[PDB]
Amino acid sequence: ARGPKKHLKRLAAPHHWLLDKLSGCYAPRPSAGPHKLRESLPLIVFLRNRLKYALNGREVKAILMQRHVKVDGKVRTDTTYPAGFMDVITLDATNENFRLVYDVKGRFAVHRITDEEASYKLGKVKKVQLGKKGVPYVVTHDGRTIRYPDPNIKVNDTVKIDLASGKITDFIKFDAGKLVYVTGGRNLGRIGTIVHKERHDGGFDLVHIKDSLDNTFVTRLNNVFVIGEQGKPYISLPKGKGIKLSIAEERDRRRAQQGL
Amino acid sequence: TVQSERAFQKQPHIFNNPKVKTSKRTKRWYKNAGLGFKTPKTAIEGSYIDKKCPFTGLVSIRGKILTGTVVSTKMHRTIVIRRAYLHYIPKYNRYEKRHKNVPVHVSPAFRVQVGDIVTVGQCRPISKTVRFNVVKVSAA
């Protein structure tokens, strides 16, 4: 090519959006924004393929232009604005508040939360540096920079952000035995706790995570998102709570539950 | 000997004040390479100047790590390494031998004759055909 690309074809669209392969020829292509391309979800896949409120594209623009939909206490009208992990989607004419978080089979789940949990947001720590005129800042996974932190924060920790003023309340370190979400790969959406973490110099470091039913697995370091101390998260988890169920176990658990 | 080239030779931005006097020879500068590698004795207290050395020059080491035997030392500050493997052919269920030569760079801290076996690490492009330089050595 010569410049940037601007169309996304239909079969090349990311799989966990679940667009059906016969309705059109192209998919929505997500704008450049806070979250990466194949790790996010536009506002048109939310408002017509999950909540079933709108039936077209022409209906979604009619919703967005009435200035209903906010993200993180700020109004958006970009019809493919890229909402990603841990974002808060506050409609107003229904008094519903949502939070983007992962399913267990690997999907973005519809999650309703309260009116008080929708005042804050976690975020991990991607780098910490010394800026111009000697002040330091910190970069989160969604790209917020925040100057003047505590000195005890290091990288791969987790901050808590107040969405009103854009500030920090407290923070969680990163060591053995913590509650951890997994945000990328194969064991995607499972919740467990840290056994220990071995390190390879000049390579990709591996953590070992134990479930609650005590079965273990291994992922790279960067697909690991700290949530809280053991038995106590800071957010409202979905049903199943990140427990991997074998396919044998979930036929008959659907069978015996089938009593309607 | 160390001044044979037609322009003056120095680790740049390393200043000697003649007004002061201190019984050191010259303020040499030297770094630690990383990855559990050990800077040799003859680099910290040696007297050569080389632009492209891992312990003295301005190159980094990152990327791969290889290993192989040295088969030609006929250039000035480069050698050639031979590497040997096998290759599997599925229909016949068997292996066949192959090889590839790589050229690397040799700092004058090391003394490498033919027949030895070195380990080498990767740096940014040094010449037309060079992307590695030696970081350890073990004899024959």
Binding site: - | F8, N16, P18, T129
Partner: protein
């Protein structure tokens, strides 16, 4: 134009390569600017991105630097004596990096008397109050003051003039000067 591809050379084997695409704009060269001495002529070229470079077509002054004292003043330049790449730039007096020129020594000498009060070669009470302070740091190397009778120092250029536009540098000192002066008066 001048392109910087490696697709026109031969392999490490000697095998002659093949014509693969047409010539791409993002591998280009421009023309070498030779930098004469004279009145100020500086032209601006436009680069990748919206940036800017200043080509110097001829200039005459600079901004040179005394290391051991730590003072950098603005002077004039006179002519090049030595260039280690080819000696067809000394016979034309271009201006590259690593070129060895001569400057006029006047504002360094005029600074030196103001800082110390001592001559080179051969009255308020504030002044000798602090001239007495800078007493031990008075003397310098012999072989560098020994050209203050002529006002022609020896200095090398450390800025690329074809890129940055300017032409600055630093004074030769005795360790480096011992090398070049043995090179200067023997290779001719």
């Amino acid at each position: 134009g001048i392109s910087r591809d490696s697709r026109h050379k031969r392999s490490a084997t000697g095998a002659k390569r093949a014509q693969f695409r047409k010539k791409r704009k993002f591998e280009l060269g421009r023309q070498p600017a030779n930098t004469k001495i004279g009145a100020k002529r500086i032209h601006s070229v436009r680069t990748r991105g919206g940036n800017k470079k200043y080509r110097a077509l001829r200039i005459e002054t600079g901004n040179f630097s005394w290391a051991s004292e730590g003072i950098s003043k603005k002077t004039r330049i006179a002519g090049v004596v030595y260039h280690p790449s080819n000696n067809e730039l000394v016979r034309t007096n271009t201006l590259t990096k690593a070129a060895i020129v001569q400057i006029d020594a006047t504002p360094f000498r005029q600074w030196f008397e103001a800082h110390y009060g001592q001559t080179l070669g051969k009255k308020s009470k504030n002044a000798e109050r602090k001239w007495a302070a800078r007493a031990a740091s008075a003397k310098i190397e012999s072989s560098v003051e020994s050209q203050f009778s002529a006002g022609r120092l020896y200095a090398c250029i450390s800025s690329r003039p074809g890129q940055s536009g300017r032409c600055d540098g630093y004074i030769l000192e005795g360790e480096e000067l011992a090398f070049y002066l043995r090179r200067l008066t023997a290779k001719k």
